[PDB]
């Protein structure tokens, strides 16, 4: 797709937006590619996850949802509209975008259009409100009511498809084609008015059900099963782990770059035991005031070395001026970048990139000259 490495390397506008956003990488590209003549594909071959993150920060979109249910007024009543809510209205409701295309750039402005829509009966129908006749509505949006019913019919036509026999309720009512019992009463039937025509709440039920079905089918894009469904997994055997087991052998090799017998072991042991038996003067550990000086000198020299090393160990302050320090730091940075690219092409072992390896070597030699 668009997330492949070759797509990320050739996306110039993404790099444009990244350098407009980033500052330190902008300076690295300024003092590395623009001045020293490094190829830009070489610069972006090492920064593929950063380009991917910058692209995916804006490429992803939120899930579809009932945006008009979230719309609610708060005499003066105010409703706050964000651009994401407008886009969700356009995607979730094609009738509003259809009115927007031929209404806003032609006759009246966008806030006027949204206030007309919010004052119209089409908003009430799309939100699921049962349509009332005493409300005035908005006539401009009310011209789109018939085309909204046309969209409803087209969506109901395209959404229809043969379901499996597991959930075939249309089958269930047609199991007996000539079943004819006593008719269901008004409780089992949709509500009707005093004349006999419907009250219109089945219309709002169909509208919200169609909205839910649209939300589910909106997930179907580029972005035997009955045997598995009727199988009872609980009665089947539990899952057995097929994890790998290793046996480790400690028969390594010794590190490579006097044999004495048990008799003198026994005599040395006897010497230690009777030297323990007779007497240990604990004052014999005191040095003869001569080896103490030498060992003290050794200890003090070790202390001096360790203290000199550990005296100095956010970057530390430097004696260089900030202009010279910044120049040295950026020269170190382009040294590191050129060495990075040279070692990447050098260790990637292709004879086809030998010319690039030679160019990186020449750039490194010129950077040695710059140092």
């Amino acid at each position: 797709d668009s997330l492949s490495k070759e797509k990320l390397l050739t996306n110039l506008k993404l790099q444009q937006s990244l350098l407009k956003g980033n500052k330190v990488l902008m300076k690295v590209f300024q003092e590395t590619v623009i001045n020293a003549g490094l190829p830009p594909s070489e610069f972006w071959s090492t920064r593929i996850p950063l380009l991917r993150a910058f692209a995916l920060s804006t490429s992803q979109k939120v899930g579809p949802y009932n945006v008009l249910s979230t719309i609610k007024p708060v005499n003066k009543v105010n409703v706050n509209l964000s651009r994401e809510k407008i886009l969700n209205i356009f995607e979730n409701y094609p009738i509003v975008k259809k009115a927007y295309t031929d209404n806003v750039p032609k006759n009246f402005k966008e806030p006027e259009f949204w206030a007309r829509f919010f004052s119209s009966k089409l908003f009430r129908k799309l939100r699921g409100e049962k349509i009332m006749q005493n409300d005035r509505g908005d006539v401009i949006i009310d011209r789109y009511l018939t085309l909204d019913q046309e969209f409803d019919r087209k969506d109901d036509d395209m959404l229809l498809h043969p379901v499996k026999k597991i959930i075939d309720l249309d089958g269930n009512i047609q199991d007996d084609p000539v079943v004819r019992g006593n008719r269901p009463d008004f409780t089992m039937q949709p509500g009707v008015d005093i004349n006999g025509n419907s009250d219109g709440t089945v219309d709002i039920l169909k509208g919200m059900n169609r909205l839910s079905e649209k939300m589910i089918m909106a997930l179907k894009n580029e972005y035997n099963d009955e045997r598995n469904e009727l199988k009872i997994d609980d009665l089947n055997e539990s899952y057995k782990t097929n994890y790998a087991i290793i046996h480790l052998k400690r028969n390594a090799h010794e590190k490579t770059t006097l044999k004495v017998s048990n008799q003198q072991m026994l005599q040395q042991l006897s010497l230690v035991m009777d030297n323990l038996i007779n007497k240990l003067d604990l004052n014999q550990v005191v040095p003869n005031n001569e080896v103490s000086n030498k060992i003290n000198k050794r200890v003090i020299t070790a202390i001096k070395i360790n203290a000199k090393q550990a005296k100095h160990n956010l970057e530390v302050k430097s004696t260089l001026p900030i202009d010279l320090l910044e120049s040295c730091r950026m020269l170190h940075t382009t040294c590191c970048e050129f060495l990075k690219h040279f070692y990447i092409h050098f260790q990637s072992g292709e004879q086809k990139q030998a010319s690039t390896v030679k160019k990186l070597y020449n750039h490194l030699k010129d950077c040695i000259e710059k140092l």
């Binding site: 110039l12 444009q16 350098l19 407009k20 500052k23 902008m26 300024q30 623009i34």
Partner: peptide
């Protein structure tokens, strides 16, 4: 100021587009 930096960057990218085309 980074205004001259992005102006020279846009000029460089325009020259690169002219060379590539």
């Amino acid at each position: 100021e980074e205004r001259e930096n992005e102006k020279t960057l846009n000029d460089y990218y325009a020259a690169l587009a002219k060379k590539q085309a």
